Amino acid sequence: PLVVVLSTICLVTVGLNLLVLYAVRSELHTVGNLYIVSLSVADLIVGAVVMPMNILYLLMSKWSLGRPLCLFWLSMDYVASTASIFSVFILCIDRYRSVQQPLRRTKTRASATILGAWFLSFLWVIPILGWNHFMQREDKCETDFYDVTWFKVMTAIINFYLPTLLMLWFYAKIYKAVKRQLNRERKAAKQLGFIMAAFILCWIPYFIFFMVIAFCKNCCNEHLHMFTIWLGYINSTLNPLIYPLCNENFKKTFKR
């Protein structure tokens, strides 16, 4: 019942993101829409590499995937999540730059910034790779730290709440700059705000959920845990679904 729904979700996500990539390569193709490629590839990663592993983990309780396989799937999960987060962050920082800095280039620095974001995302693999090797179960497919709670909550902090406040600060700065300067820019701000809202609304449930469950006595809510997992994955799917409806140009692009 659920497995077919999640498989349909995966196929829709991969297909729509592949069509987005095909549209990007076919034509756009400028300073505008410069980092939505990063969101598209992040969604490709999360869908393609996590969703099959997630449905395998979910169809029954505790199928073991293999120790290196579980490590690598967890690594892709976390690095793709943080890469998408900071990809939105650097997209917003570049929009702020494009709107304010030329008062006081973009193409050549965009590649450097995206590779830097990818590198800072992929340095997250090292904590997972080494926990007892240098920094002193098999049926389970967590292979992470549960006993230490403050490290987990600190990781949650640095991966969600600091980017959230950076998003809010940048949104306020953009709004104030637009107000003091004065329809196309209004539409761009509206689509960015809708992406931010979908992001926050449909990724906050699991984040706060395991923030509370990082330590509790009523932590036995695994069904709602997996519900929030597939909810967040749906949000990752629908970010490139909220995106196309706002822009008419790329709308006509994928109409082809």
Residue numbers in the entry: 29 to 55, 58 to 134, 139 to 170, 176 to 221, 408 to 481
What does the paper say about this structure?
Enabled by our recently developed method, we successfully solved the structure of H1R in the apo state. The determined structure shows that it adopts a typical inactive conformation in the apo state. Interestingly, although following exactly the same conditions, the apo form of H1R had lower quality density maps compared to those complexed with inverse agonists, suggesting that without inverse agonist stabilization, H1R may have a dynamic structure. Finally, the model of H1R in apo form contains residues P29-E55, L58-R134, R139-Q170, R176-L221 and N408-R481. Therefore, the high basal signal of H1R may not be attributed to the preexisting stable open conformation of TM6. Interaction with a G protein appears to still be required to stabilize H1R in a fully active state. In the apo state, TM6 and TM7 appear to adopt an intermediate conformation, and this conformation is induced to move in opposite directions by inverse agonists and agonists. Therefore, the ready accessibility between TM3 and TM6 in the apo state of H1R is probably one of the reasons for its basal signaling ability.
